[PDB]
Amino acid sequence: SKRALVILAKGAEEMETVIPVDVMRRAGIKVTVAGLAGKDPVQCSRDVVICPDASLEDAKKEGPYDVVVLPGGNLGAQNLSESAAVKEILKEQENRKGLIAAICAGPTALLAHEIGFGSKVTTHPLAKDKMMNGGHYTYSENRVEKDGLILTSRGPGTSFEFALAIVEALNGKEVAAQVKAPLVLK
Template identity: 25%
Template sequence: MTDSPKPFHIVFLLFDGITQLDFTGPAQFLARMAGAAVHTAAKQIKPIETDSGFAILPSKDFADCPQADLLCVPGGFGTKDVIADDETLQFLRSQAAGAHYITSVCTGSLALGAAGLLDGKRATSHWAYTALLEKFGATYEKARVVKDGNIITAGGVTSGIDFALTVIAEIAGQQFAESVQLGLEYDPRPPFHSGHPDLADPELVTMLRDRIYAKQVADLADIIDRS
């Protein structure tokens, strides 16, 4: 008889307005590790509205959530409510105190910052929101994945897959991480080279920033300043 691997508890925070790929992307990869136990945690066990037109039912509420070995905070337009909610921030602090890895994807890093977990740390976020990191005492580093001690932050949305592979390689070795990448056929070759402001047409960057992100950033900055 062989011993079962020790459970490795992976906790994703869920909240209304979440960008579902921020967590479903890395979850798909991290779940391939031996012993991986993926938990989705929210204040209440009720359908969580994503930004993609469908809802997700969390598996745990805050009171019943096990201690995370890896804590991950995804992003989304609902981040503004997370950073203003004391109960959620306290949950993040409590989980972070015992976690081996404290992580985020996209604007989830702002929630980590609001919980006081990024002070003095290097971090990243979605390109439109990176200037807000300094409000939490963090230093922005331009990269898809930034690791500072046991804090790992990923850039916007699809960067979460890169973060997951980084963690898998550290825990289970590069060869296993590569096998997961191969099994899930993660071989990105986008039809356009406009996935980052450094590559996209400047007019497109300005249009997107003005139409979508400027108000979101201003609202978040106001909430942070009032906290």
């Protein structure tokens, strides 16, 4: 009954894609993995090939979504940053006061599309300078940062924390705790 849209572009970090999709489905969220380029399989940064559930064009017609999720991976985030379709989805989600979650270089697509300026954010350490160009955000080193409806995180190793923060935001702390225990997190 909550719904998530995960936007999958060539060059996405596959761990940052699969960990949130899997954890959100464990939480009972209806997740649509949507291909930026169309319905065809997507070659991720480390050459894992993932078949999306739908094209982004089709998935948009089925919104709105409770969260829009942007994986990282530098080339994936670049492709999200260059997409007019992504711009329109994020602007509409911002406008309706829905959650936007981005991990690793993913938040640099928020910069590109002028989303969430004035928010505290984090990114992978190597993406800090790009994200901070112009001083439009306030930078954090927290592993997960949530400033209202903009949720960001740092890297593959923060992907479980990121996904469980999404789950808590949508489904509450009790569901997040229930989902977390079987994962054998430290």
